[PDB]
């Protein structure tokens, strides 16, 4: 049979894994960046070697559409793929923030990830269905991309989309869109 375990400590590494935490898993293949899974259940086998029940986060590439324009570098999709893996497969814990708490980060580390979509793998479906769009390029926000906010419309714009490159945009003390100064 199997006992269910409250906590796992990885490799005496001062790191404690509990259900609900997000962790990284070594791929067998050398090239790949580590997989990112949410631990849902920890349990010890009959012979007392530990195993974990996993929900997978999908990278945009694994996903239906592939990486898109607005998909950030650390975009993940919570899947509905489940699995079970040896807990020796775990390397370190990582964090997968909500979109908003990601945007709030003082600065991003390899540790840090974010998710704004649940992705059904068999149907290829995405929840939610609607995205919010910005600028007059009218694209969804990509956190990697720098955006500036007019003080009139208080809409957000890409510097290039309004005809300035990034480092003058950094210089702007005050910004008003051209559409505010017209007609």
């Amino acid at each position: 049979g199997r006992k269910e375990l409250d906590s796992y400590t990885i490799k005496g590494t001062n790191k404690v894994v509990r259900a609900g935490d997000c962790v990284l898993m070594r791929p067998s293949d050398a090239g790949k960046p580590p997989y990112v899974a949410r631990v849902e259940k920890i349990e010890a086998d009959a012979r007392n070697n530990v195993k974990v029940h996993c929900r997978w986060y999908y990278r945009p590439e694994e996903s239906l559409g592939g990486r898109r324009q607005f998909h950030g570098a650390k975009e993940l999709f919570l899947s509905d793929h489940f699995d079970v893996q040896s807990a020796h497969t775990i390397e370190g814990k990582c964090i997968v923030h909500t979109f908003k708490n990601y945007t709030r980060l003082e600065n991003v580390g390899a540790e840090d990830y974010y998710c704004r979509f649940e992705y059904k793998a068999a149907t290829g479906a995405f929840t939610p269905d609607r995205v919010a769009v910005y600028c007059k390029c009218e694209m969804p926000y990509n956190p990697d991309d720098l955006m500036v906010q007019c003080e009139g419309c208080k809409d957000w714009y890409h510097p290039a989309c309004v005809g300035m490159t990034i480092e003058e945009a950094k210089k702007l003390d005050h910004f008003v869109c051209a559409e505010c100064s017209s007609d």
Partner: peptide, 5 residues
């Protein structure tokens, strides 16, 4: 102005 990162 206010920027987003």
């Amino acid at each position: 102005a206010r920027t987003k990162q």
